[PDB]
RNA sequence: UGACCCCUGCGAUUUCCCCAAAUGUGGGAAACUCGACUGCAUAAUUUGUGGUAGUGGGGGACUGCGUUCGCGCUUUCCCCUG
C-alpha cells in the first residue's frame, strides 16, 4: 500500500458521494463537488442525517472546513 | 491610528469573552490588542439560582494584569484616569 | 501560498471554480440562500458581494431560531453583515 | 533525536492500528491503519473503527480522513 | 516587538500568576519568557475552577491558550513607560 | 463555565425543517445585473477594436503595397533601414551604404501632410549579393550617433505581411511596459 | 518561528493537562515550534483511577494544554 | 477585499450583535484591518443584562458575530472598491 | 581599469580592457581616442 | 466649526546643476540604507476568521429517590424577566 496523501485521497473523493460528521454531530452526505485549499467542501443533492438518523433532504450546500469533524466515503 | 493612542492612560473597563469585567488603567496595547492594566479589579455576574435575589458580584483586586487580545472583547471608559493633583 | 508573486489571481479562478463559486453565482443570480450560523439561528437571505474570508453582504434577510416547549421566533433585517467564521452551513435555493 | 513526523512516518510504514482522539471531546475515537499525512496533521486511515467509551460499540467506516485540528492524542494498537 | 511582551520580558525572575482559557490560575516564579507568551514557572500555586489546590515544582504553559497574566505592580515604574 | 463542561440544552440543529425558500418560477430580476466603471470600458474597448478592425479591411482593399509607384526595383535586392536619425543627410545614407555595394536607388520616405523625414529608407543595391552582404553587418550600425537596425524590406516578399497600422511589423519598443528592452536591436 | 525552550524538561518524567480534562503522563524526548511533543512510556490517565499504559505516543501542541516535570527537571 | 468597505461605514449608525449574544448600537467611527470597530455614542445590552449607555467602546473582531447596517445604504455604488 | 575612450565617429564613451578587440560598441567605428588625463598640468603663462 | 487657496505624503543621510540677501535660507534629478505604512507566508496548531455558541433565571400548582427537612438529582402546566 503506497502512501496516499489526504490531499490526493480527497481529489479523488471528488465526484463521488460521502458523508461528513460535524463537530455537533449532524452529518451530511451528498455527491462531493468540489473543494479548495482550506477544505470548504461543497456537496449536491445532499441529505442532513440529525444524531445518525436520516432527517432530511437538502440539495446543494457549501459548508466550511473548520466546522466538519471527520468525511468519509459512501 | 489614534483611536488608540487618544485613550492611553486612561481607566477602562475590558468585557471578557466569559462575562467578566476587568477595571483597570489601561497602559498600553499592541497590533495583537494585548493590554496592560494597572490597579485592576475583576468582577462577574452570577445567575442566582435560590430565588429572585440581586445579581451576585464578586470582586477580586489583581494589581498590574496583561490582557490578552484574543481574551479581549470590548473595552469602554469608566472613569476619567486618576487624577494627581489634589 | 504556491504563487508567491504579488500579481497572483489565485483567489479569483478560486472564486470562479471553486467551492466558493456557489456565492459568486449566488450574487450573479440574485437567489436567495439559507445559512446555518453558530448562534444555533439560521439567517435566510441574498447575497451582494463576499470574499475569501467568507463573508458575505446580505440584504433583505430573515433570521430564524427557536427556543426551549419548542417555541419559535423570527424577525426581518433589510440589511446586515455576516461573519465568515460564525457560518456553519450554507444551501442555495435547491429549485 | 525523533520528531513526530518521523515518528507518523514509522508508524505508517509499520501500517499499525493508530488511534486518535478528538479535540474538545473525550467520549469518542477512532482507529485505523494510517495510509499518509500532510503538514496540516490531517490523516488518512483505510479501514477506520468509531469507538465510545460509554457504549463500547465499533462502528466501521472504511477509507476515510481526519483532520488534524480534531486530532488530540495518538495511540498505538 | 510589542510593548506587552517587552514588559513580560522584564518581568522575567519575579512571582507572576497566570490564568488560562481552561479557568485554571497559577501563581509563582517566572523563569523564563519567550516572544510567543510562552511561560514557565516554578513552585507554583494551582487554583482549579472548582477551587481545589494542588501543588507542583516545575511547569511550562504555552501562550496562545492563556487568558491573562498578573504581574508585579512595581513594573509600572520601568523606564519606557 | 468551561467549554467542555458546559451542558448543551439545546445544541445546534440541523436545516431540514427549515426550507422555506421561493417557488422556481418566481425567478430573480434579469435587470438587477450589472456594474459601473467595469463594463462600460470593456464595451469601449471592443468598439474601437472593431472599428479599427474594420478600417484595416477597407485600407487592405483600397491601398496595394505591391503596386505603389514609390517603390520599385527588385524586392529581393531592395533593402529596408529604420531607425535613422533625421538629421542623416542623403550623402551621408549612401557613404554609409554604398560600402556593401553599389546602389542603383535610395528612397527617403517623407510624412505625406506634415513632410517630416519618417526614419526609415529603402536602398536598391546594384546586386542581390551585395543587399545579403549588407544584411548581417548592416543591422546594428550608428548613423549620426543613433543606432539603426536593417532586415530585408518582407513588405513584397514574406506572405501576409503588413506594418503596425495593420497589425503587423516587429519590434517592441512601444509594446507593453518592462517587456521589451531597449538595448536590443532587430 | 523561535522554538519554545523545552532543553529542561528533555528526558524528564511529565504531566501534561489536556483541553478536554483529560491529563496523561510520560517522559518527553522531543519538541517542535508548534509545541508538538513526543513522550514516551505515557499513561492514558483517564478520569476513573484504572490506568492504562501504551508507551511510545504523539500530542498536538494545539491540544497541549500544560506540561509539568514531576521530576522538578 | 472587502474591510476596506467596512472600515468606510464611518460617521454611521449600526447593530452589531456579538458571538456571546450581546447587541450594540451606534455610530461608528474607526476600523482597523483586524475588524476591530469604534463605537461612539453607543448603547450595548449584554445577555440577560440591562442596557447601558457608554460613550466610548473599541471592539474586537474576533468576538463579533454579525452587523446590521441601514437600509438606505449604497451597495452597488460602495462595492465598487 | 575602466579605460574610457572617445569613439572617432560617434564621439561616445566606452570602456575597453585590455585584449578586448578595439571597436566601439555603440558604432563598430575601430578608432578611439584616450580621454584627457587627470593629473595636475600646470603652464606659466610666458 | 470652518469656505477659498496649496503638496499628492515621509522622519534622516549622499551626489550633480541652478536662483540666491552667495558657507545659511530653496528648487529640478535619482541612489540604495532604518522605521512595524500596506499586500502576500496571515482563515491550516501561537492572537489579524472561533470548539468561549447566547442555548437561561425566578413566582404559583405539579412527581419520585436520599435527607441534616436547609437541600442534591429528577418529572409536568400557567406567569414576570432577557
Ligand atoms: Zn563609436
Known sequence: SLPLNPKPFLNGLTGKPVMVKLKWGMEYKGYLVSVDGYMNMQLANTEEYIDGALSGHLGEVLIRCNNVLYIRGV | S????????????????????????????????????????????????????????????????????????????????????? | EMTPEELQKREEEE??????????????????????????????????????????????????????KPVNKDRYISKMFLRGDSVIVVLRNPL | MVQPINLIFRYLQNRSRIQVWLYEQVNMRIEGCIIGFDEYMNLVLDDAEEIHSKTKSRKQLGRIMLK???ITLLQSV | ?????????????????????????????????????????????????????????QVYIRGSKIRFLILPDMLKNAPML | ??????????????????????????????????????????????????????????????????????????????????????????????????????????????????????????????????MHSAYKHADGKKIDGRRVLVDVERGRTVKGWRPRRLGGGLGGTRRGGADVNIRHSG | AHPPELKKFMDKKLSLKLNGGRHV????????????????????????????????????????????????? | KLVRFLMKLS????????????????????????????????????????????????????????????????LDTLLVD | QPMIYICGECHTENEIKSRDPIRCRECGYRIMYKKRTKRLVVFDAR
Open chain 2, 2 to 86: 489614534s483611536k488608540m493612542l487618544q485613550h492611553i492612560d486612561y481607566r477602562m473597563r475590558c468585557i471578557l469573552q466569559d462575562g467578566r469585567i476587568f477595571i483597570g488603567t489601561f497602559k498600553a496595547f499592541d497590533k495583537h490588542m494585548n493590554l496592560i492594566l494597572c490597579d485592576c479589579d475583576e468582577f462577574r455576574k452570577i445567575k442566582p439560582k435560590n430565588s429572585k435575589q440581586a445579581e451576585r458580584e464578586e470582586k477580586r483586586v489583581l494589581g498590574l494584569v496583561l490582557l490578552r487580545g484574543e481574551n479581549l472583547v470590548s473595552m469602554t471608559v469608566e472613569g476619567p484616569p486618576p487624577k494627581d493633583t489634589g
Open chain 3, 15 to 68: 472564486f470562479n471554480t471553486g467551492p466558493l463559486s456557489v456565492l459568486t453565482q449566488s450574487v450573479k443570480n440574485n437567489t436567495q440562500v439559507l445559512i446555518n450560523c453558530r448562534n444555533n439561528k439560521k439567517l435566510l437571505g441574498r447575497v451582494k458581494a463576499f470574499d475569501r474570508h467568507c463573508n458575505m453582504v446580505l440584504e433583505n434577510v430573515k433570521e430564524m431560531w427557536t427556543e426551549v
Open chain 4, 68 to 70: 488534524g485540528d480534531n
Open chain 5, 1 to 57: 516587538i510589542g510593548v506587552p511582551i517587552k514588559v513580560l520580558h522584564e518581568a522575567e525572575g519575579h512571582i507572576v500568576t497566570c490564568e488560562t482559557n481552561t479557568g485554571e490560575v497559577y501563581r509563582g516564579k517566572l523563569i523564563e519568557a519567550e516572544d510567543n507568551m510562552n511561560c514557565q514557572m516554578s513552585n507554583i500555586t494551582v487554583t482549579y475552577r472548582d477551587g481545589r489546590v494542588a501543588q507542583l515544582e
Open chain 6, 1 to 130: 463555565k468551561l467549554p467542555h463542561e458546559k451542558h448543551h440544552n439545546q445544541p445546534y440543529c440541523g436545516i431540514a425543517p427549515y426550507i422555506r425558500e421561493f417557488e422556481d418560477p418566481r425567478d430573480a430580476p434579469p435587470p438587477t445585473r450589472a456594474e459601473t466603471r467595469e463594463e462600460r470600458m470593456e464595451r469601449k474597448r471592443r468598439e474601437k477594436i472593431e472599428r479599427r478592425q474594420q478600417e484595416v479591411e477597407t485600407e487592405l482593399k483600397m491601398w496595394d503595397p505591391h503596386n505603389d509607384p514609390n517603390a520599385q526595383g527588385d524586392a529581393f535586392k531592395t533593402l529596408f533601414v529604420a531607425r535613422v536619425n533625421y538629421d542623416t543627410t542623403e550623402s551621408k545614407l549612401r557613404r554609409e551604404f554604398e560600402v556593401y555595394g553599389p546602389i542603383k536607388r535610395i528612397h527617403m520616405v517623407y510624412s505625406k501632410r506634415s513632410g517630416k523625414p519618417r526614419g526609415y529608407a529603402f536602398i536598391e543595391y546594384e546586386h542581390e549579393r551585395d
Open chain 7, 25 to 73: 503522563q510520560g517522559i518527553l524526548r522531543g519538541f517542535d515550534p508548534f509545541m508538538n511533543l513526543v513522550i514516551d512510556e505515557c499513561v492514558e490517565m483517564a478520569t476513573s483511577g484504572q490506568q492504562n499504559n501504551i508507551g511510545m505516543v504523539v500530542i498536538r501542541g494545539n491540544s497541549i494544554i500544560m506540561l509539568e516535570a514531576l521530576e522538578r527537571v
Open chain 8, 11 to 74: 460617521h454611521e449608525t449600526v447593530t452589531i450583535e456579538l458571538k456571546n449574544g450581546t447587541q450594540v448600537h451606534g455610530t461608528i467611527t474607526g476600523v482597523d484591518v483586524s475588524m476591530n470597530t469604534h463605537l461612539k455614542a453607543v448603547k450595548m445590552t449584554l445577555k440577560n443584562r440591562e442596557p447601558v449607555q457608554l460613550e466610548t467602546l473599541s471592539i474586537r473582531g474576533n468576538n463579533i458575530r454579525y452587523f446590521i447596517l441601514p437600509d438606505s445604504l449604497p
